[PDB]
Amino acid sequence: RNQVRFPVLSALPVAYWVNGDTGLKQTTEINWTNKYLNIEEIATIVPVPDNVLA
Amino acid sequence: ATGRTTEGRTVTVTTASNTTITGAAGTFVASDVGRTITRAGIPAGTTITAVASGTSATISAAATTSATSAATLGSLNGQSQGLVGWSPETDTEAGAYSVAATNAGTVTPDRLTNAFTPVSQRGR
């Protein structure tokens, strides 16, 4: 068909230290997005006189 | 090395002729509220009703005289603290572990602050 979609990764998690053995922990979330391929067309046309073909 | 305890202690304290008591540095601490206090110039059954600093506190009745003297602070049954014995943590450093204190960035009494110091045991 005229177009097709690829999903792709777009951001990454990270990690942390905490302040001593009792410090408050921290948050992260991963993400994705899209990329596309799409279609186009080539043509040519060739004329000739009917007598030449005979 | 001083920590917390339920058992009583003796202290030197100054009376104003009202509900106010004062004394030297470290004579009072936050856990003392609800203890009995027995001194000359103090009416019978008097208790610590509030504490305001290491040097000052409030009592349930007016002192009858203004003077400085030795005085006795009573023991208590261990309802107003979880502990019945003694613990190495004092009242202030025992407070350090809350979420609010953790946000304020206050160091615990045992956060090893330098790369080359040893960990060490406390004693009485």
Side-chain angles (χ1 to χ4, degrees):
Chain A
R1 290 189 167 82
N2 181 65
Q3 174 175 356
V4 309
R5 185 167 63 86
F6 308 100
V8 70
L9 186 146
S10 68
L12 290 169
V14 300
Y16 308 103
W17 314 92
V18 298
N19 178 21
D21 66 11
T22 298
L24 182 57
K25 292 161 186 165
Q26 303 199 145
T27 49
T28 60
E29 192 180 352
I30 193 164
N31 288 285
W32 298 265
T33 192
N34 289 294
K35 181 164 291 192
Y36 294 111
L37 159 68
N38 54 359
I39 300 299
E40 296 298 343
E41 83 181 37
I42 300 286
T44 195
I45 175 166
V46 177
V48 65
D50 299 342
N51 299 319
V52 175
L53 258 291
Chain B
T2 53
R4 281 172 299 153
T5 181
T6 64
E7 290 200 346
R9 72 179 190 275
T10 184
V11 288
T12 54
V13 305
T14 303
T15 51
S17 293
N18 60 56
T19 55
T20 315
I21 303 298
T22 65
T27 50
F28 308 103
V29 80
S31 51
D32 290 324
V33 69
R35 288 182 150 122
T36 56
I37 174 65
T38 59
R39 183 192 174 276
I42 298 295
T46 297
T47 64
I48 308 302
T49 52
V51 59
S53 70
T55 60
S56 68
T58 305
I59 52 162
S60 64
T64 65
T65 64
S66 301
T68 304
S69 314
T72 307
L73 289 167
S75 64
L76 79 182
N77 69 5
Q79 289 291 349
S80 60
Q81 285 101 74
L83 172 67
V84 295
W86 172 96
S87 163
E89 296 180 312
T90 56
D91 282 341
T92 57
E93 77 200 320
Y97 309 94
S98 78
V99 65
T102 303
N103 174 55
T106 56
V107 293
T108 67
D110 57 5
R111 180 59 180 151
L112 193 79
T113 294
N114 167 283
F116 61 73
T117 51
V119 174
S120 65
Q121 300 185 188
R122 284 190 177 185
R124 186 57 178 274

